[PDB]
Swiss-Prot record:
<comment type="subunit">
    <text>Heterotetramer of two type I and two type II keratins. Interacts with PNN and the actin-binding domain of DMD. Interacts with HCV core protein.</text>
</comment>
<comment type="function">
    <text>Involved in the organization of myofibers. Together with KRT8, helps to link the contractile apparatus to dystrophin at the costameres of striated muscle.</text>
</comment>
<comment type="similarity">
    <text>Belongs to the intermediate filament family.</text>
</comment>
<feature type="modified residue" description="Phosphoserine">
    <location>
        <position position="9"/>
    </location>
</feature>
<protein>
    <recommendedName>
        <fullName>Keratin, type I cytoskeletal 19</fullName>
    </recommendedName>
</protein>
<comment type="subunit">
    <text>(Microbial infection) Interacts with hepatitis C virus/HCV core protein.</text>
</comment>
<feature type="modified residue" description="Omega-N-methylarginine">
    <location>
        <position position="2"/>
    </location>
</feature>
């Protein structure tokens, strides 16, 4: 799960 809808930068 990506916290705070992680952007492609983080994900």
């Amino acid at each position: 799960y990506r916290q705070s809808s992680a952007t492609s930068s983080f994900g």
